[PDB]
Write a protein that binds this ligand. Structure first.
Ligand SMILES: OCC#Cc1ccc2ccncc2c1
Ligand SMILES: OCC#Cc1ccc2ccncc2c1
Lengths: 313, 321
């Protein structure tokens, strides 16, 4: 197949592992690094603006809690997105397998969600589709935010002002719904029709189960404010008393994953693969075209970060 | 929830894949303990693909075959359609093709006789699949093919309603067809990609692919046996009236080679002849009498009966907790 010729120069394709925005996701191996990847396969003959908004957000976003874009390939009838492999499943799966999570367990997970969304917002974006299906665990059981198809969703996770049509404050409401579903195992607003769900969201009344601590209840009232001018700010969420209870330091949201600083060990290994001198290699890396080069650089950087040698072939 | 009625019957596991444009999850059927694939359709998200879901469900209600991935249970809620299906952990025929060089003729025959079986059964039921491709064939846990994705299936003689490389000439132009001849073309495309590792008609644009399909001219690689070449010419006839019939495909010499018996296409999976170890265990658990199951509503009863029948076929006890 001519649709897979350029792909298979770079990647050893494995089995179907899932789904991403109606696109199939397959396991693969990046050949040069030996590193495992997720490949999202789009058919461009069978939601094209959604694909392009995602790609363009993922080109500008780079963070420890955002599932990394490595490589975009485009053929006759296909778009391939080479992404960070998350074998740990969805946060959805995790919620439904236990009944809910304990307060201590959802702090661990929720501090990662806060980190990622605080970073998204600092870049001038709102994700506009925060939900547990859209968070995946990596090999180290750390959350990675996916689905950037809406940018700057599920009705149950949508803010009041969003349903009215009257942008980053709506994400805080969506993290509130998330906080609740984690500790409860059910949504705070749920109905059999869309109009009854909408009316529930507009009222802002929800059950407070017995097992919820007063600290949990306070944070939920601050995030699940129907008035977005009354909603908790990102600033005050970061060092909220609930957020800092077992970790007496605020959420570190700032990216540890740069666009500007280049790892010298990776540049010298890329130079020996390419047969060239630095500054030709750095200038090439710094272009960030989301081609085989950025894939290999970022996966060499991920190889180095797991302790394994910063080596190619 | 959206998941309240589902979770009475199934223990949900992880996301394993995609069916059409919908999530597939691993699950366990609580009563029988048997593993299951659950296709999840969001009702107010997919919209324009709702008639595709209903065409699949209605075909899968009327098709029951050893080489068709089995429908157990349809659940419909507020914002969801669940299809509970036969678990196929062996991956796609696509994966098998892309993992190695071309298959040997003998490897192809093994696999291709199963494709013929399934499609001859589909056609005997008055259907045409219309989307035959190696992504729509899955291996079960004993490495046997199961036909999937009936969203574009049609009754060619009934009431009215794929991949371009697999599409028949008359299908790209839209002719007055008995519709099942287009599936024979697609199996010929399949036969070629299996023995060659590449498609007989392939281009960088859709218009150049279409024109190649209309001409009907393709390379015959050196490694292809004369037997293979003959069968390919019979199936890859551009005139659907000149294409090999299902009848002559079933006992074709290439097909018969090494096996020396024709493809057995008729279903070993009945709607009528109930194996009553299942009926008697369905009578003890569900406290009522043996005057049936035969309604086949694709509810929890259909699922449990068919999975009990599967659990018996595995050797495991005919038991309902
Ligand atoms: O941000 C777009 C994406 C994605 C995505 C979807 C499913 C995956 C499964 C496993 N590993 C990574 C994945 C990434
Ligand atoms: O014909 C409808 C169907 C289906 C389907 C799709 C994906 C699967 C993955 C694993 N096991 C069974 C599956 C069935």
């Amino acid at each position: 197949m001519k649709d897979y010729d350029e792909l298979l120069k770079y990647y050893e394709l494995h089995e179907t592992i899932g789904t991403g925005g109606f696109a199939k996701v397959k396991l693969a191996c990046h050949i040069l690094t030996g590193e495992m990847v997720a490949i999202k396969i789009m058919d461009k003959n069978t939601d094209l603006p959604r694909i392009k908004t995602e790609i363009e957000a993922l080109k500008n976003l780079r963070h420890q809690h955002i599932c990394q874009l490595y490589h975009v390939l485009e053929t006759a009838n296909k778009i391939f997105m080479v992404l960070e492999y998350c074998p740990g499943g969805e946060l959805f799966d995790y919620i439904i397998s236990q009944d809910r999570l304990s307060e201590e367990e959802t702090r661990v997970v929720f501090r990662q969600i806060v980190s990622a969304v605080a970073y998204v917002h600092s870049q001038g974006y709102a994700h506009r589709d925060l939900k547990p299906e859209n968070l995946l665990f990596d090999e180290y059981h750390k959350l990675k935010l996916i689905d950037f198809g809406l940018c700057a969703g599920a009705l149950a996770y949508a803010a009041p002002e969003l349903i009215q049509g009257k942008g980053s404050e709506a994400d805080v409401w969506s993290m509130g719904i998330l906080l609740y579903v984690l500790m409860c195992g059910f949504l705070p607003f749920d109905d059999d029709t869309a109009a009854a769900l909408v009316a529930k969201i507009m009222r802002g009344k929800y059950d407070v189960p017995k097992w919820l601590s007063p600290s949990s209840i306070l944070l939920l009232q601050q995030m699940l404010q129907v008035d977005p001018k009354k909603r908790i700010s990102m600033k005050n969420l970061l060092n909220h008393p609930w957020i800092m209870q077992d970790y007496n330091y605020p959420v570190e949201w700032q990216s540890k994953n740069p666009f500007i600083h280049l790892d010298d060990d990776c540049v010298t290994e890329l130079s020996v693969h390419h047969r060239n001198n630095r500054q030709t290699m750095e200038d090439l890396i710094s272009l960030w075209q989301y081609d085989h080069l950025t894939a290999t650089y970022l996966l060499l950087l991920a190889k180095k970060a797991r302790g394994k040698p910063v080596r190619l072939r």
